[PDB]
Structure formats: C-alpha cells, structure tokens
Specification:
The protein has five helices and no strands. The chain is mostly helical. Helix 4 packs antiparallel against helix 5. This is Bromodomain adjacent to zinc finger domain protein 2B. It is found in: Nucleus.
C-alpha cells in the first residue's frame, strides 16, 4: 500500500533474458508455424476466428521497441501464440503438435529463468 512495499526484485536483466528465451524459441525446429504472422488473405477463417493474432516476429518487434511494460506482458503474448494455435488446429496434426511442444519448451525456460 502507500509507503509499504515488498523488497525490490532486480528486473534490470529481464529485457535481455526475454530476448534470449525468444531466440531459443525462434531457433527450435518446431517453430516454423509461429515465425511469421498467419497470412490473413490466404487462410480462410483465420481473421474472423482469431481475435488477436500473434507470432514470434511480432513479439520480437514489440520487445525490441519497448512495447512490453514487464515480463508478464511478454509471457502473455507468447502464450497467446499457443492458445491461438490450439483454437485453429487439431491436436492430431503437425501444427497442433508443434504448438504443444513449443508451449512446453517455453514454460520450462520461463520457470528456469525467473522462478
């Protein structure tokens, strides 16, 4: 509350560390469905169904230009990529499997880096 704060967590490396995690997501072999925005002209249904499209290149631009106010808002966009993927793709497809794998990979890096 006013003049009553928990001890200050050092957040000065968060930016760099989020960039690293993102680089590891970008270079994973199963990242291919997620590297670029889904082409909304060429994938019927995507625009209407997915209210908030997100992909790694868009996360990279937001990160690099100071558009994440904190590490939680960064994790929300990453999770959105996988939530979107689950919404549009059957679990039993290459893309569906890609998303499950990438989400697990992300969550572990997240916990090991910050928790």
């Amino acid at each position: 509350s006013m003049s009553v704060k928990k001890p200050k967590r050092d957040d000065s490396k968060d930016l760099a560390l989020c960039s690293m995690i993102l680089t590891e997501m970008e270079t994973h072999e199963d990242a291919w469905p997620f590297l670029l925005p889904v082409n909304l002209k060429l994938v019927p249904g995507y625009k209407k169904v997915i209210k908030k499209p997100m992909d790694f290149s868009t996360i990279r631009e937001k990160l690099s230009s100071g558009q994440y106010p904190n590490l939680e808002t960064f994790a929300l966009d990453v999770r959105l990529v996988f939530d979107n993927c689950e919404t549009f793709n059957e679990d039993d497809s290459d893309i569906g499997r890609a998303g499950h794998n990438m989400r697990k990979y992300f969550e572990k890096k997240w916990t090991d880096t910050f928790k």
